[PDB]
């Protein structure tokens, strides 16, 4: 249930995930159950939230900063810091707006790339008609 | 005649050995269900699915003077028995070198398409639109025939049409605005080329 | 085993004596049965692993009689529903329904057991919107007048037309009647939501919906809708982009859903529009450039 949660891009919440796994896996020694392993339970906090970030970026071109703070379950300030590290390490790239209006998850795409791409969608529509025509032939015989 | 197929094989092997028996042509035009039955005798000879080459002899369809179809065997759903059926494949002509060179001496036509000068392709733009329009109307009447004359619903067709509505450009999108910019540039470049030709004519 | 050895012996003689016989029919059929015994015997690990090996052989053969491939599929299916993998039961079971003997060899009693399990599987699916195909398959075809297929159909039908008032009324009863729906309350409640979102966007010509529009469609608050739609992207139900500032969800993909008589009409209407346009263009460009084409 721990691995498959983390595998699926389905959103989960930290202080609730924590409870689920508190009396079971927090109490397995040499993982999280040792004294200095308790701070690896604590380090899991960071993992859970950076994962939810990673998914949310792709799906939402734009999401309001306020909304994000509730989903992530942390103050605005902590939230501000974790976005910045994830951009540095370059998995995503993003633009954050300081008055706290929007966080616009996007890597921008130029006019040339967007236009080049438009010609291809059109090429595929033209194919679609052509195939149907052979099968019209067939179908009249079949009945 | 079984024996004739056999006799020809040792003759054709000597003549050119890259030849193999590969199937049979039908005069067509009609696609029969007697062709499932003829394919089974050719299937004895052949090492491939028997190639059915429908060479139209009346040449009514100017474009597509050829259809190619290969016998497949596939699980028919709805709890129905496995069916042997004809799946279309690209019959499109390429030509060998030796054949092509003589053909080219004979003709000098501007054909269905040569992509020659401006004049030739300008014709093409009208004709090609008209090709599509023809194609398109038939798809409209096919859908009436499902619900009026009770053809068995060929769901494949419906699948393709979903992909047409979905991957259909949507208007009001800012992509359209981009398009207009590209248009603006080329129409300008035409204007500058037009002027340079003025300088040539003036000399 | 006795019969397997019998057929090996037998063919030493027959293949030459007859000048033609095939003996491969019995062998495969027999192997399906081994796997099947093991299933009843509660050796579930063993039975899967034989079955996979079987798969390899079957497919090397290029012509098999229907009976063979249906028995294999009968087994492959039986294993899935014993593990209580609902999704998997349903996917693999479709293969068995396709090759199925329209013959009444498959006794009426068998048809009811698998059909019930499948229906229940589809409710507890989350993207399995196949429900009409069953009606054209023997499995459910003959039996639609059982008491079991009274309540159960009303659940299917409430999904189809997408009414949430109707679903809600039905679901209270069936949660209590049937203890399988009772432990799977959460999924059933989720099913209706997902079904409506994919149905609504399609039928409207626009392939973008405001969170405002969806809120009325799904007859649930816009607060709940934002959470629901995010999940649709994760599942792969719909794929697209979420803009909270333009208050839109822009789809760029509509996942295959089975088309039905009504829906054919909606498509016909869109293509009508398209045909008239090509014509207007072509008449226009003929007049223009008339003087010089060539």
Swiss-Prot record, chain A:
Domain PCI: start-end pairs: 1-110
Keyword Acetylation: yes
Keyword annotations: Acetylation, Proteasome
Posttranslational modification: N-acetylated by NAT1.
Disulphide bridges: none
Organism superkingdom: Eukaryota
GO cellular component: a single term: proteasome storage granule
GO annotation terms (biological process): proteasome-mediated ubiquitin-dependent protein catabolic process; protein deneddylation
Homology family: Belongs to the proteasome subunit p55 family.
Protein purpose: Acts as a regulatory subunit of the 26S proteasome which is involved in the ATP-dependent degradation of ubiquitinated proteins.
Note: Present with 5710 molecules/cell in log phase SD medium.
Name by which UniProt lists this protein: 26S proteasome regulatory subunit RPN5
The species this protein was found in: Saccharomyces cerevisiae (strain ATCC 204508 / S288c) (Baker's yeast)
Lineage of the species this protein comes from: Eukaryota, Fungi, Dikarya, Ascomycota, Saccharomycotina
Region of the whole protein represented: 298 to 440 of 445
Swiss-Prot record, chain B:
Gene Ontology CC terms: proteasome complex; proteasome regulatory particle, lid subcomplex; proteasome storage granule
Keyword tags: Acetylation, Phosphoprotein, Proteasome
Post-translational modifications: N-acetylated by NAT1.
GO molecular function, one term: metallopeptidase activity
Domain of life according to the entry: Eukaryota
Biological process according to GO: proteasome-mediated ubiquitin-dependent protein catabolic process; ubiquitin-dependent protein catabolic process
Keyword check for Phosphoprotein: yes
Note from the entry: Present with 19800 molecules/cell in log phase SD medium.
Function: Acts as a regulatory subunit of the 26S proteasome which is involved in the ATP-dependent degradation of ubiquitinated proteins.
Protein family membership: Belongs to the peptidase M67A family.
Stated name of the protein: 26S proteasome regulatory subunit RPN8
Gene source species: Saccharomyces cerevisiae (strain ATCC 204508 / S288c)
Gene: RPN8
Swiss-Prot record, chain C:
One Gene Ontology MF term: structural molecule activity
Superkingdom in the source lineage: Eukaryota
Positions of the PCI domain: 88-256
GO cellular component terms attached to this protein's record: cytosol; nucleus; proteasome complex; proteasome regulatory particle, lid subcomplex; proteasome storage granule
An example Gene Ontology biological process: proteasome-mediated ubiquitin-dependent protein catabolic process
Keywords: Proteasome
Miscellaneous notes: Present with 12400 molecules/cell in log phase SD medium.
Protein purpose: Acts as a regulatory subunit of the 26S proteasome which is involved in the ATP-dependent degradation of ubiquitinated proteins.
Family per similarity comment: Belongs to the proteasome subunit S11 family.
Annotated protein name in UniProt: 26S proteasome regulatory subunit RPN9
Annotated source species: Saccharomyces cerevisiae (strain ATCC 204508 / S288c) (Baker's yeast)
Classification of source organism: Eukaryota, Fungi, Dikarya, Ascomycota, Saccharomycotina
Underlying gene: RPN9
